[PDB]
Amino acid sequence: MGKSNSKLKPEVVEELTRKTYFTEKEVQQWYKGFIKDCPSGQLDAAGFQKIYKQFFPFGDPTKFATFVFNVFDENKDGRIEFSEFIQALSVTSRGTLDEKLRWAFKLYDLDNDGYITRNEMLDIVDAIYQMVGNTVELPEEENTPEKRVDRIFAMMDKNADGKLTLQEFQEGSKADPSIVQALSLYDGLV
Ligand SMILES: [Ca+2]
Ligand SMILES: [Ca+2]
Ligand SMILES: [Ca+2]
């Protein structure tokens, strides 16, 4: 009676914990955490930039933050929802290689209209480079493959397609690794 409208239902918590890579306490603290600030549970694009800023506070242009929100919103409604943030955040921790790879392509292309161009690849690389600049937690001295893709992909797009398409990206990513090596840090080889 009234209290039922507090905290998320336990049935979904159990099924959500089945897949989360995080513990139930971390999910409830996050849910109750921003829920108090926004009882609706729906965060605007700026809200997503704020939490992203916490993960990457050494950033500045924030262009990378809004860019993610632009292609990180499943409903593209201009706002991140509680189910999308908690579920998407869990995928960000370490979802299936296929799920994490999908998030990589969405971010790799700002308008991800199915075709990727080098200007978009360089623009996104600079976006994550500035966010990963300073020392928030950049990989090794500079694993971020910027010039590496310029030559590596330039070699793969010689076919003369005129553009870069997921057909070569996804097939090359599963055929010739390094093409999608995310600059993210890997917990281990297992
Ligand atoms: Ca949404
Ligand atoms: Ca595009
Ligand atoms: Ca091509």
Side-chain angles (χ1 to χ4, degrees):
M1 187 76 205
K3 295 185 185 76
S4 68
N5 76 169
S6 185
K7 298 184 185 277
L8 24 56
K9 317 205 309 88
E11 185 184 2
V12 87
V13 174
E14 121 64 25
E15 185 184 1
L16 181 62
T17 61
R18 288 189 181 275
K19 30 174 272 290
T20 323
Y21 317 106
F22 261 37
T23 67
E24 184 185 358
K25 287 80 169 167
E26 295 181 348
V27 172
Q28 293 178 345
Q29 289 182 177
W30 264 210
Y31 177 62
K32 190 182 189 336
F34 53 86
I35 283 277
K36 293 190 294 315
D37 294 347
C38 164
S40 187
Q42 186 177 354
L43 304 181
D44 298 346
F48 191 79
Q49 295 184 79
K50 292 184 185 188
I51 48 91
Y52 216 58
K53 184 77 168 275
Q54 299 300 310
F55 315 146
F56 307 91
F58 299 90
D60 260 292
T62 234
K63 294 174 63 155
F64 61 94
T66 306
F67 275 32
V68 182
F69 138 76
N70 192 355
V71 299
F72 180 83
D73 185 5
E74 292 296 343
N75 307 137
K76 297 180 66 153
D77 63 330
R79 302 184 68 197
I80 251 301
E81 299 183 352
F82 152 41
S83 68
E84 293 182 351
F85 164 32
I86 223 293
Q87 295 187 81
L89 182 77
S90 67
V91 173
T92 266
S93 306
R94 47 191 81 159
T96 325
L97 185 72
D98 67 79
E99 296 184 352
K100 185 183 186 169
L101 190 80
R102 292 274 297 162
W103 289 112
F105 295 126
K106 295 185 184 76
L107 183 67
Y108 219 60
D109 191 347
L110 198 299
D111 56 325
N112 75 100
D113 62 336
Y115 262 85
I116 301 199
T117 79
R118 310 313 197 294
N119 298 130
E120 295 183 350
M121 182 178 73
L122 273 287
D123 188 6
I124 296 305
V125 170
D126 189 6
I128 73 181
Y129 205 111
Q130 294 177 339
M131 183 185 73
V132 174
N134 303 125
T135 77
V136 68
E137 250 294 347
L138 73 180
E140 212 185 359
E141 295 182 351
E142 187 183 2
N143 197 50
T144 165
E146 183 184 2
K147 184 80 172 60
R148 296 185 69 195
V149 292
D150 292 348
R151 184 184 298 290
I152 288 172
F153 248 123
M155 182 184 64
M156 196 182 194
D157 188 5
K158 294 194 294 189
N159 89 244
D161 283 338
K163 300 184 266 181
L164 202 81
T165 306
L166 284 68
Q167 295 178 344
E168 296 182 352
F169 221 137
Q170 294 178 342
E171 294 296 343
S173 67
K174 197 88 64 21
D176 308 280
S178 92
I179 293 173
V180 290
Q181 55 202 119
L183 7 297
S184 305
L185 293 68
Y186 69 94
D187 189 4
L189 27 153
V190 190

